[PDB]
Structure formats: structure tokens, C-alpha cells
Paper text:
PrPC is a cell surface, predominantly α-helical, glycosylphosphatidylinositol (GPI)-anchored glycoprotein that is sensitive to protease treatment and soluble in detergents. The structured C-terminal domain (residues 125–225) comprises three α-helices (α1–α3) and a short, two-stranded, anti-parallel β-sheet. In this variant, the glycine at residue 127, which is fully conserved amongst vertebrate PrP primary structures, is substituted by valine.
To determine whether the overall structure of PrPC was affected by the protective V127 variant we crystallised recombinant human PrP (residues 119–231), with valine at residue 127, (V127/M129 and V127/V129), complexed with the Fab fragment of the anti-PrP antibody ICSM18, as performed previously with G127/M129 PrP. Here, we have shown that there is a close similarity in overall structure between both V127 variants studied (V127/M129 and V127/V129), and wild-type G127/M129 PrP. This region adopts an essentially identical conformation in both the V127/M129 and V127/V129 structures, which differs significantly from WT G127/M129 PrP. In contrast, substitution by valine at residue 127 results in the formation of an additional pair of intermolecular hydrogen bonds in both V127 structures, between the backbone carbonyl and amide groups of G126 and A133 respectively, due to the alteration in backbone conformation.
Numbering used by the authors:
A (entry chain H): 1 to 215
B (entry chain A): 125 to 223
C (entry chain L): 1 to 211
Write the structure that this text describes.
């Protein structure tokens, strides 16, 4: 029933600082603990520190002292992590995690990109076939090209479509990301029904919907 | 308060609870718990368990009033954990008083 | 501080198989915690206090160990269990994590299904020309792609990306994108995407003419 909402992705200049939040949404516990954790290149996990939100006590990993400061706003159930003086080693996903006896919940994570480059929105291009015309099901896609920073999220008809969707990890090339997503639907439904990918780029606040018409 | 003995400091022991959640909570909060105990003189008690019982209540009372005029709230988790470590501390104090 | 070493680092198991992975510690801990992470999502506590299951964790999982040596066991490997598993200790500050055990499931081999897409007019109209190739739902993951342009090979300006093992059918998928200038594209007719894989002795080919 409890849920941890973390604030959204951040693009920060080196030397700057940034504050991210984690609010315990439905919570009923008195004494729980909140850990903060970093994950680098979707692999290695490091404990940063914790706080008991109610009232006061705060622990740091010695390695992150002077780099992270943890505080809590107890009237609005929100915990904050301030990151000081960012470098590229600070780009990562940052999680908060709640513990109380047997129960544990992680937030969905907050991607922080430390970079001098400026935001760029994606161009979205629909991928239809034109003459390669079906047996069985049929494949479409969307190409999402030349954006920065991560992430973007891609949905098909808004969630309505989630069977035979592959969405591929972005890859950096020349200082901008490019990703793609495919979807496979039955010959019969296409072109007759109307297919859309919806791309959202938080860091720039573009949300584009691009319809897939037939070549 | 002139009726109590105030013992000298001792190292706070580590207590274990049966879950990692509590063991960790304890270790992380224990600096906020006391490191000396208040007791009534030994010559009022005919045995250890009675000495210990009194030492626990009095010590906990004084610690809770003196840190609440310093804006420290102790949760119910806290008093339950002070119950346990003050008990060990009062037993050690009892041993100090018996040679 | 306390260094947690997990092994093996990567393991493959077939369905129904008993699987065991170990986390060992440079000094004693009282309890060990294990976490599951599937790709794209965040870690989720899986076993806590050495051997208790977090909620939602299937019965086929178990945990044990003491001192410096801990294990996570799956009595009977299922496709959904394919993930990365980490151990974690709360004995002393700093709390640390192991390096992970990546667990994959074996399946029967499968050829990919290949779609090539020419570029959208929207793209051409604003400078570029990306031709795109999807290679979907194959196993095992070792695949290789090569692009062709009226017979000539092209190895630069090409982006490749793989998904991870699918929870449902346990396959892999991949896209390959060939980016070109509009002009260079306007001067060739025949665009071929070409895949080499265990399931075929000869290449798998998809192509379109610019007409």
C-alpha cells in the first residue's frame, strides 16, 4: 500500500548541485528507515546513507560525505538527497528504499546525467512497411533519434498495446541518443485500426504522438 | 534525587534482537541511549533481580526527562530498546558493587 | 569494508533445474539479504534475514548460510526467474552489495524474424535517411548483422542494440540502424539487411528497392 515516488530525471552541469526527492506516499509506520542507493551503468550498487524520518538520525557512507547531504521534511513525508559538486562519476540512477521489519519498497529511481551538453528533443519517425505486405502478424516500429538526455519512454496506443512490443536500449552515438521500438500486431488489424507510438521526453517536456500510416 | 547513586560510565553493549532490522536500528541509534545508570544503594536490596528492576526504571526516567528538555523524542521502539540495554548495564553495575 | 563476492557471475540453467548461487563475505555477518533486479526496473528485496521470503516471492526460492558463506537456491528454474541477483549486508557501515549473479534460462534454438524499414518521408524532408532492421525473438543471443547497398558492404554509421532475455518466451531481440545522408541514399537502389545465426547455415536476408 505504501509507495515511494521519486522526483524525475535531471540534467546537471558539472560543478553544480542537484536535489532529489523521495516521498512516502501512503505510509502508516512510525519508525522506518530509508536508505539511499546508487547504481552505476545499470550494474554496481552502492549504499550512500540513510535517515530515520521521524525523528532525526542520519548515517553516511564515508565515501559520500561531502558529496551527499540527507534531510527530511517530516510534515510532507518527503526525504531529500542533495548532491554537491557533480562530476561525470555522479551520473547514475539513485534509489531510495524504505524498510520496516519485513517490509521493503524501492522507488523507481532517479536518473541523473551530469553533462555540459544541452537538452535536445528527439525526432520521432514512424516505421511502416510499404510493399513487404504480411503473412501471419505484421511489424511496425518507431525510431526515436537524436535526443539528449535519457530517458524517453515509448508506449503504443498508450498502454493499450503491450503484446509483442520490444523497446530497445538507447545507444549514444556522437553525443546524442537513439532508440527504437517495434510492435507486432495481426495482419487483419492493420492498416484498418490506427496505430500510434507516444514518445515522451521528460528532460525537454516534449510528448509526441506519431501515427503509423501505410508507406 | 540525593537518594540515588549515579554510577560511572561504562561502554554501551551490543544487544541482538532476532532480526537484522532491529540489530541495525539499535546499532545506529545506541549513541542516544545512556552510558551510566542511576540506582538506589545496594543495602536496600535482598537480591539482584530487584536491584536491576529499580535501576532500569529510574535510569530510563532520568534519561527521558533530561533529553526531552533538549528536544529529543524517544519512540516506543526506543524505550523498548533502552529497556534492554539499561538492563545489561544495571547488571554490570550490580557486579561492580559486589567486588 | 565487508566485501561481498558472488558466484558465479553469469549462469545459464534449463527449466525445472535446481540452481544455486553463493554470496561470500570477507568477514562474518549475522544475516544476509538478497535482491532481484529485472532489466529496466528497480531492485526488489527477495529474501531477507537470510532465509525469509519477501512478499510476492514464489515458494521455490530459498535462502541459507551463516558466517561468511550464504546461498540462494531455486528449487526449480522457471522462465520468469531469469534476472540479476544481488546479496547485501547490514553488519557494518558501509553496507555493501555483491557484484551480482546474472541468471539466464536455456531454451530450444529459434531463428529471428527480420523486418527492414525504409526511411520516413518526414526524415528525408529534414536532412537524414535512416534505414532500420529488426531481428526479433531469436535464441541463442549470438547473432551478426551486415548491411548491403547495391552489393557493397557498409560498416560505419550503424547502431546496434539488444534487448535482454524475455521473461515470457526467453528470446532475444535486436535492432540495427544504418544512418546515411539523404544524398548518398538518393543515389542507391538496393538496401539489404543480412543476418547470420546458429539456426541457419546460410544468411537471412531482407531488402527493399528505393522504388
Amino acid at each position: 500500500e505504501v509507495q515511494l515516488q521519486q522526483s524525475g530525471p535531471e540534467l546537471v552541469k558539472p560543478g553544480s548541485s542537484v536535489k532529489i526527492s523521495c516521498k512516502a506516499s501512503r505510509n502508516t509506520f512510525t519508525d522506518y528507515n530509508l536508505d539511499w542507493v546508487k547504481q552505476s551503468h545499470g550494474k554496481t550498487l552502492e549504499w550512500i546513507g540513510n535517515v530515520y524520518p521521524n525523528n532525526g538520525v542520519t548515517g553516511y557512507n564515508q565515501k559520500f560525505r561531502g558529496k551527499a547531504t540527507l534531510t527530511v521534511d517530516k510534515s510532507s513525508s518527503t526525504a531529500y538527497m542533495e548532491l554537491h559538486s557533480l562530476t561525470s562519476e555522479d551520473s547514475a540512477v539513485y534509489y531510495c528504499a524504505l524498510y520496516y521489519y519485513d517490509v521493503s519498497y524501492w522507488g523507481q529511481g532517479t536518473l541523473v546525467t551530469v553533462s555540459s551538453a544541452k537538452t535536445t528533443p528527439p525526432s520521432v519517425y514512424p516505421l511502416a512497411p510499404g510493399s513487404a505486405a504480411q503473412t501471419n502478424s505484421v511489424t511496425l516500429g518507431c525510431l526515436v533519434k537524436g535526443y539528449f538526455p535519457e530517458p524517453v519512454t515509448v508506449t503504443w496506443n498508450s498502454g493499450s498495446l503491450s503484446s509483442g512490443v520490444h523497446t530497445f536500449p538507447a545507444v549514444l552515438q556522437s553525443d546524442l541518443y537513439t532508440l527504437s521500438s517495434s510492435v507486432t500486431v495481426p495482419s487483419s488489424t492493420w492498416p484498418s485500426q490506427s496505430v500510434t507510438c507516444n514518445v515522451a521526453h521528460p528532460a525537454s517536456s516534449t510528448a509526441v504522438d506519431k501515427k503509423i500510416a501505410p508507406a | 534525587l540525593g537518594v540515588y547513586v549515579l554510577g560511572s560510565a561504562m561502554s554501551r553493549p551490543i544487544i541482538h534482537f532476532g532480526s537484522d532490522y532491529e540489530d541495525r536500528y539499535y546499532r545506529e541509534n545506541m549513541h542516544r541511549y545512556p552510558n551510566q545508570v542511576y540506582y538506589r544503594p545496594m543495602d536496600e536490596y535482598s537480591n539482584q533481580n530487584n536491584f536491576v528492576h529499580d535501576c532500569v526504571n529510574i535510569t530510563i526516567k532520568q534519561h527521558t526527562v533530561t533529553t526531552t528538555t533538549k528536544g529529543e523524542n524517544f519512540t516506543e521502539t526506543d524505550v523498548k530498546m533502552m529497556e534492554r540495554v539499561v538492563e545489561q548495564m544495571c547488571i554490570t553495575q550490580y557486579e561492580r558493587e559486589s567486588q | 569494508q565487508i566485501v561481498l563476492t558472488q558466484s558465479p557471475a553469469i549462469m545459464s540453467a534449463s527449466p525445472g533445474e535446481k540452481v544455486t548461487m553463493t554470496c561470500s563475505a570477507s568477514s562474518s555477518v549475522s544475516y544476509m539479504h538478497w535482491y532481484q533486479q529485472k532489466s529496466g526496473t528497480s531492485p526488489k528485496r527477495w529474501i531477507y534475514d537470510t532465509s525469509k521470503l519477501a512478499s510476492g516471492v514464489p515458494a521455490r526460492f530459498s535462502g541459507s548460510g551463516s558466517g561468511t558463506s550464504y546461498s540462494l537456491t531455486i528449487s526449480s528454474m522457471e522462465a520468469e526467474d531469469a534476472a540479476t541477483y544481488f546479496c547485501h549486508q547490514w553488519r557494518s557501515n558501509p553496507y555493501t552489495f555483491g557484484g551480482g549473479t546474472k541468471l539466464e534460462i536455456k531454451r530450444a534454438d529459434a531463428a529471428p524474424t527480420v523486418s527492414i524499414f525504409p526511411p520516413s518521408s518526414e526524415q528525408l524532408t529534414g536532412g537524414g535517411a535512416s534505414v532500420v532492421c529488426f531481428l526479433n525473438n531469436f535464441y541463442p543471443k549470438d547473432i551478426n548483422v551486415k548491411w548491403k547497398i547495391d552489393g557493397s558492404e557498409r560498416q560505419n554509421g550503424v547502431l546496434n542494440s539488444w534487448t535482454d532475455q524475455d521473461s515470457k518466451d526467453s528470446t532475444y531481440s535486436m535492432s540495427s540502424t544504418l544512418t546515411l545522408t539523404k544524398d548518398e541514399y538518393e543515389r542507391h537502389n538496393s538496401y539489404t539487411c543480412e543476418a547470420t545465426h546458429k539456426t541457419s547455415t546460410s544468411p537471412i536476408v531482407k531488402s527493399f528497392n528505393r522504388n
